[PDB]
């Protein structure tokens, strides 16, 4: 099997979600050792903002963007397990992750319109979302990130999604420790499945 890991934090080596993603990769290498793992850091290697010119896809800029979209989509379709690091910034996902989504959602490519509604074309995937927050939002009205990810990933065909939460990072060393340890335990559950 092939694992794709998508990093999206702007906090680099101090990122909670990157730390957890790195733990996931270490554990996967140990316990599913046949598997190939690809790590794409959407902060280290940013994806452009979808603007009028890019959606309008040609200008050299439009051709580059189309090529990139194509690369990202081919990479997504080429992996079996998709790990998405989704830190919350201002009640949204990071813009780094969003830009990725805006180039991967493409009619006729990652979803198609049918008589019954749109249907996703990225099928047979298993996703794991590692989502870090300073506060505590899980199962509450201020967590729009979780249902949005479920909705967006479902739309492109990725309906099997497991969420790993690291919440309360901002509430002191103990709460932060608890967030890390609970997330690592959830990851270990998944890895050993």
Indicate whether 79 belongs to the interface with ligand FMN (CB under 6 A): no
Indicate whether 21 belongs to the interface with ligand FMN (CB under 6 A): no
Beta bridge partners of 5: 39, 83
Beta bridge partners of 53: none
Which residues form the interface with its own copies (CB under 8 A)?
10-12, 43, 46, 49-52, 55, 89-93, 95-96, 98-99, 101-102, 105, 141-142, 144, 147-148, 151-152, 155
Nearer to ligand FMN, 90 or 192 (CB): 90
Indicate whether 95 belongs to the interface with ligand FMN (CB under 6 A): no
Q: How far is Cα 189 from Cα 187, in angstroms, rounded to an integer?
A: 5
Q: Please say whether the beta carbons of 17 and 69 come within 8 A.
A: no
Indicate whether 9 belongs to the interface with ligand FMN (CB under 6 A): yes
Calculate the CA dihedral of residues 122, 68, 86, 125 and round it to 10 degrees: 20
Q: Which phi and psi (to 5°) does residue 12 adopt?
A: 55, -125
Diameter of the chain measured on Cα atoms: 54
Choose the stretch contacting ligand FMN; rule: CB under 6 A; options: 109-117, 120-128, 132-140, 181-189: 132-140
- CB 193, min distance to its own copies, A: 27
Nearer to ligand FMN, 35 or 182 (CB): 182
Indicate whether 99 belongs to the interface with ligand FMN (CB under 6 A): no
Please give the distance of CA 97 from its chain centroid, rounded to a whole number: 7
Residues contributing to the annotated binding site for FMN: 9, 15-17, 88-91, 132-137
């Amino acid at each position: 099997s092939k694992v794709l890991v998508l990093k999206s934090s702007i906090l680099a080596g101090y990122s909670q979600s990157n730390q957890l993603s790195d733990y996931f990769v270490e554990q996967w290498r140990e316990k599913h050792s046949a598997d190939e793992i690809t790590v794409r850091d959407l902060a280290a290697n940013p994806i452009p903002v979808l603007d009028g010119e890019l959606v309008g896809a040609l200008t050299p800029r439009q051709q580059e963007a189309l090529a990139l979209s194509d690369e990202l989509i081919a990479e997504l379709k080429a992996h079996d397990v998709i790990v998405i690091a989704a830190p919350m910034y201002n009640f949204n996902i990071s813009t780094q992750l969003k830009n990725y989504f805006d180039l991967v959602a493409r009619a006729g490519v990652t979803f198609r319109y049918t008589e019954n509604g749109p249907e996703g074309l990225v099928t047979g995937k298993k996703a794991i979302v590692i989502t870090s927050r300073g506060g505590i939002h899980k199962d509450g009205p201020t967590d729009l990130v979780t249902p949005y990810l479920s909705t967006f990933l479902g739309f492109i065909g990725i309906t099997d999604v497991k969420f790993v939460f690291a919440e309360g990072i901002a509430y002191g060393p103990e709460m932060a420790a608890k967030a890390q340890s609970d997330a690592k335990a959830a990851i270990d559950s998944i890895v050993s499945a």
